[PDB]
Paper text:
We recently identified and characterized a fused toxin–antitoxin system called CapRelSJ46 that protects Escherichia coli against diverse phages. CapRelSJ46 contains an N-terminal toxin domain and a C-terminal antitoxin domain that normally binds and autoinhibits the N-terminal toxin. Activated CapRelSJ46 then pyrophosphorylates the 3′ end of transfer RNAs, which inhibits protein translation and restricts phage propagation. This alternative trigger, Gp54Bas11, is a small protein of 66 amino acids with unknown function.
This structure showed a small, six-stranded β-barrel with one prominent loop between β-strands β1 and β2; β-barrels with this topology are very rare in nature. Thus, the structure of Gp54Bas11 is significantly distinct from the AlphaFold-predicted structure of MCP from SECΦ27, with root mean square deviation (r.m.s.d.) greater than 14 Å. By contrast, A7 is disordered in the complex but is part of the β-barrel core in unbound Gp54Bas11. The A7V substitution may have stabilized the unbound β-barrel, which would also have prevented activation by preventing the unfolding of Gp54Bas11.
Author numbering: 3 to 66
């Protein structure tokens, strides 16, 4: 119900230091969020291995 994902693309408009390329993020599959920078971000599934922030599609995470 939880998966570890790697940030592979990040929106350049994001604050420097948030969703750095290469870090491991944990995604809660039931509620479809990821925990990062003390916040709960909404994520959506693009493919079985690729995920993006629900609103910011240009920040993409890859299942590890």
């Amino acid at each position: 119900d939880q998966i570890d994902a790697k940030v592979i693309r990040r929106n350049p408009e994001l604050t420097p230091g948030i969703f750095k390329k290469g870090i491991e993020i944990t995604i809660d599959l039931e509620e479809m969020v990821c925990y990062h920078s003390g916040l709960t971000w909404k994520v959506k599934q693009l493919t079985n291995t690729l995920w993006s922030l629900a609103g910011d599609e240009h920040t993409v995470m890859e299942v590890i």
